[PDB]
Scaffold this motif. Structure first.
Motif, PDB file in Angstrom:
ATOM      1  N   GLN E 127      53.475-105.675  56.119  1.00  0.00           N
ATOM      2  CA  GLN E 127      54.422-104.695  56.627  1.00  0.00           C
ATOM      3  C   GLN E 127      53.703-103.361  56.701  1.00  0.00           C
ATOM      4  OE1 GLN E 127      58.214-104.628  54.618  1.00  0.00           O
ATOM      5  NE2 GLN E 127      58.892-106.295  55.953  1.00  0.00           N
ATOM      6  N   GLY E 129      54.570-100.178  57.420  1.00  0.00           N
ATOM      7  CA  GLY E 129      55.073 -98.939  56.865  1.00  0.00           C
ATOM      8  C   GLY E 129      56.561 -98.982  56.614  1.00  0.00           C
ATOM      9  N   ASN E 132      58.977-100.659  59.073  1.00  0.00           N
ATOM     10  CA  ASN E 132      58.732-102.047  59.440  1.00  0.00           C
ATOM     11  C   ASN E 132      59.507-102.979  58.522  1.00  0.00           C
ATOM     12  OD1 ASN E 132      57.793-104.507  60.265  1.00  0.00           O
ATOM     13  ND2 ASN E 132      55.655-103.866  60.398  1.00  0.00           N
ATOM     14  N   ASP E 178      62.667-106.491  53.533  1.00  0.00           N
ATOM     15  CA  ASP E 178      61.557-105.580  53.322  1.00  0.00           C
ATOM     16  C   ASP E 178      60.779-106.072  52.117  1.00  0.00           C
ATOM     17  OD1 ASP E 178      59.997-103.316  52.164  1.00  0.00           O
ATOM     18  OD2 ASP E 178      60.897-102.180  53.799  1.00  0.00           O
ATOM     19  N   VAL E 179      59.474-106.248  52.292  1.00  0.00           N
ATOM     20  CA  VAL E 179      58.589-106.631  51.201  1.00  0.00           C
ATOM     21  C   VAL E 179      57.580-105.515  51.019  1.00  0.00           C
ATOM     22  CG1 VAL E 179      58.905-109.052  51.764  1.00  0.00           C
ATOM     23  CG2 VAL E 179      56.900-107.845  52.596  1.00  0.00           C
ATOM     24  N   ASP E 181      54.575-103.116  51.131  1.00  0.00           N
ATOM     25  CA  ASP E 181      53.826-102.741  52.320  1.00  0.00           C
ATOM     26  C   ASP E 181      52.345-102.693  51.969  1.00  0.00           C
ATOM     27  OD1 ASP E 181      56.269-102.517  53.615  1.00  0.00           O
ATOM     28  OD2 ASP E 181      56.446-100.384  53.168  1.00  0.00           O
TER      29      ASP E 181
HETATM   30 CA   LIG Z   1      58.565-102.447  53.728  1.00  0.00          CA
END
Ligand SMILES: [Ca+2]
Ligand SMILES: *[C@@H]1O[C@H](CO)[C@@H](O[C@@H]2O[C@H](CO)[C@@H](O[C@@H]3O[C@H](CO)[C@@H](O)[C@H](O)[C@@H]3O)[C@H](O)[C@H]2NC(C)=O)[C@H](O)[C@H]1NC(C)=O
Ligand SMILES: *[C@@H]1O[C@H](CO)[C@@H](O)[C@H](O)[C@H]1NC(C)=O
Ligand SMILES: *[C@@H]1O[C@H](CO)[C@@H](O)[C@H](O)[C@H]1NC(C)=O
Ligand SMILES: *[C@@H]1O[C@H](CO)[C@@H](O)[C@H](O)[C@H]1NC(C)=O
Ligand SMILES: [Ca+2]
Ligand SMILES: [Ca+2]
Ligand SMILES: [Ca+2]
Ligand SMILES: [Ca+2]
Ligand SMILES: [Ca+2]
Ligand SMILES: [Ca+2]
Ligand SMILES: [Ca+2]
Lengths: 48, 49, 48, 271, 276
Positions: E127, E129, E132, E178-179, E181
């Motif tokens: 990811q 940023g 994202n 979201d993981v 980054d």
């Molecule tokens: Ca993220």
């Protein structure tokens, strides 16, 4: 009286809305439905 | 707007043009003509409206 | 005590069923020519 | 309103808190379950003595119990000069709680409505129809230019569009500029055509339960958190009342003297 | 060439201007309501779309502008949300345990997204940023991730044994995961029933608006914990009767479209641009 037939109801009042009603346009109305159930009639035969 | 309003939409020297809206109660009643055939008295000729 | 059965509709023998009347609440709207002042009377009462 | 000129250098006046506490009255509207949990009955006198420490004379405080929110909604008379309304929140009562908050917080000019004769419009944004009663079920049938229903038949009440059912209080907003026919149980409920004037400075609502949910402004866009809609968590009604008593100065500071040339007479608990 | 991006527009602060750039490729603006099926269920009518169109005609919208669209429930509407239409309003019936799914659908529709595919079974993805995310939509998505070391060795999960993977969204129509980054990730989900896309977030789609019909304010579109903005388009109402809700929307429709702005609209109906 079945589906294919129709029931006419003519209506009149002593109010101002009918005082000289001879020409009309923009005619419309809303009448809630009604139900009519037939009563019993006895065929008076001479015997039986 | 009233339930029994008496509204105008056009006026002239002799004629006018009223809009009438009224709440009414239509009480009617069905009619029938039972005509029983002659003969011995077991026959009916017509049961009409 | 008859053979003709299971047939829908309403017969003329007694559609009133002892009801003094059949009542439908309703309202209507209309637009009509009438003379300018409401002191007029079209003939409504009749001899035939 | 005549103009009132004022300088920008005049010295701040002394604190008027003592004057207003001597000259005004405070009144608390709380639900019956408060007293039920308190399990007492010297408690009104004890709280009056407690208020006397904060400076409200002995007769200045009036405790007006009400059964519950929906039942108090029906025509609330606020017999006082500074009104507090403790309001216990329960799920599914959000709209009715909001209705009551809107009603009392906002100033309304109400006119009678005769449902049986006239079809009523709504003048604009500030106009609503408020129905109050033991059980109000207002059904609306909008009308055409020729007075014919749309989405409804004007004579068949079953086809009407229900906008409130069995509610003690309903503040209905319909589409403005269209005549409507109303069906409301005339024996039970009374409906009035009201316009929202400015706010009512006299009353404050202490929501006692959950999240910030009251929406006085019926407009979807604006959801302003007015200063008089206070909120506090609770487990013990004793703790709630002690909180109010301790912070009474802040609450009455938030509130302000009512200003309106009323016309309807009603009982008030003034000194 | 362009629409004159790289040169500045000048204007005076002490003059009120007159002439306007009149442009229109339309019939007219089209309001467009999305309502849950339970609304029509409770209404129990069916000339009601006609009734509401007649109402909107009074409020100033011609007949052929307003459109009404039914969706079963918010979770099922989330899968590939299509807004085929100009001035979109979405009525979200709030209820407990749907907080995240509602907030996530709001985050998906209110914001513009630019999505690329993800050949999940071949590569490993990161990811880039803060903007994202990985958006997974389908009949039943179940995202199981596994972060990787710099040596491409899984941390907390053996890259081969999928049972050790960390599940981040379990059996959801829409999951915006979201993981961390900067970590390579191996991803596992049910490729037939779900599609996962690598989506950047552009500016906000300032077209669609969200009316939360039920209670408390919970919509947190911004996936960040620190910020919880309350945009103008996160409207809310207190409801008991869907007829009252629709009358409220109709009565205050002008203010709602004043909050919105139709200039942001795409050709396709999709809720996200696709850039292969
Ligand atoms: Ca993220
Ligand atoms: C709005 O709708 C309700 C729902 O019908 C109306 O209630 C109706 O009220 C009338 C007058 O109170 C009732 O009339 C009664 O009729 C029976 C025979 O039909 C007669 O025995 C009684 O003496 C009385 O005249 C009517 O039954 C009642 N409807 C129902 C379903 O109970 C209400 O009146 C409407 N609002 C207004 C302002 O009219
Ligand atoms: C206002 O406060 C000041 C300072 O405490 C005090 O000297 C003054 O007397 C007060 N005003 C009146 C009218 O007492
Ligand atoms: C008309 O619009 C243009 C912008 O394209 C602006 O420069 C001009 O000042 C406007 N007219 C007047 C009289 O201000
Ligand atoms: C997800 O894990 C299961 C269980 O091992 C596996 O059968 C499936 O192929 C995996 N999904 C993908 C896309 O490889
Ligand atoms: Ca209807
Ligand atoms: Ca209510
Ligand atoms: Ca209104
Ligand atoms: Ca609001
Ligand atoms: Ca989700
Ligand atoms: Ca693991
Ligand atoms: Ca956030």
């Amino acid at each position: 009286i079945k589906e294919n037939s129709y029931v006419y109801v003519d209506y009149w009042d002593d109010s101002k809305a009918f005082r000289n009603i001879v020409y009309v346009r923009s005619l419309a109305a809303n009448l809630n439905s009604v139900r009519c159930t037939g009563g019993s009639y006895h065929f008076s035969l001479p015997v039986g | 707007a009233q339930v029994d309003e008496d509204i105008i939409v056009s006026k002239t020297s002799l004629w006018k043009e009223m809009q009438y809206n009224r709440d009414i109660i239509i009480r009617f009643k069905f009619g029938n003509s039972i005509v029983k055939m002659g003969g011995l008295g077991y026959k009916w000729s017509e049961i009409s409206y | 005590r008859t053979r003709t059965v299971n047939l829908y509709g309403l017969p003329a023998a007694n559609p009133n069923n002892g009801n003094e009347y059949y009542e439908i609440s309703g309202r209507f709207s209309l637009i009509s020519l009438v003379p300018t002042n409401d002191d007029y009377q079209t003939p409504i009462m009749n001899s035939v | 309103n005549i103009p009132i000129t004022g300088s920008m250098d005049t010295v701040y006046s002394n604190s008027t808190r003592e004057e207003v506490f001597l000259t005004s009255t405070l009144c608390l509207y709380y639900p019956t379950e408060a007293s039920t949990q308190i399990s007492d009955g010297e408690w009104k006198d004890s709280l009056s003595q407690m208020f006397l420490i904060k400076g409200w004379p002995t007769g200045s405080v009036y405790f007006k119990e009400y059964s519950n929110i929906v039942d108090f909604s029906v025509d609330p008379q606020l017999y006082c000069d500074y009104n507090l309304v403790l309001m216990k929140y329960d799920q599914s009562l959000e709209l009715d709680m909001s209705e009551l908050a809107d009603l009392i917080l906002n100033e309304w000019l109400c006119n009678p409505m005769d449902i049986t004769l006239y079809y009523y419009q709504q003048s604009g944004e500030s106009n609503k129809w408020i129905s109050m009663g033991s059980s109000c079920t207002v059904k609306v049938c909008p009308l055409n230019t020729q007075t014919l229903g749309i989405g409804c038949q004007t004579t068949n009440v079953d086809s009407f569009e229900t906008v409130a059912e069995n509610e003690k209080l309903a503040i209905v907003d319909v589409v403005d500029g269209i005549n409507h026919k109303i069906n409301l149980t005339t024996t039970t409920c009374t409906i009035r055509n009201c316009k929202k004037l400015g706010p009512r400075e006299n009353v404050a609502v202490i929501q006692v339960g959950g999240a910030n949910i009251l929406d006085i402004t019926a407009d979807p866009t604006t959801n302003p958190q007015i200063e008089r809609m206070m909120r506090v968590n609770w487990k013990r009604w004793w703790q709630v009342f002690y909180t109010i008593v301790d912070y009474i100065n802040q609450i009455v500071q938030v509130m302000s003297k009512r200003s309106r040339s009323l016309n309807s007479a009603a009982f008030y608990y003034r000194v």
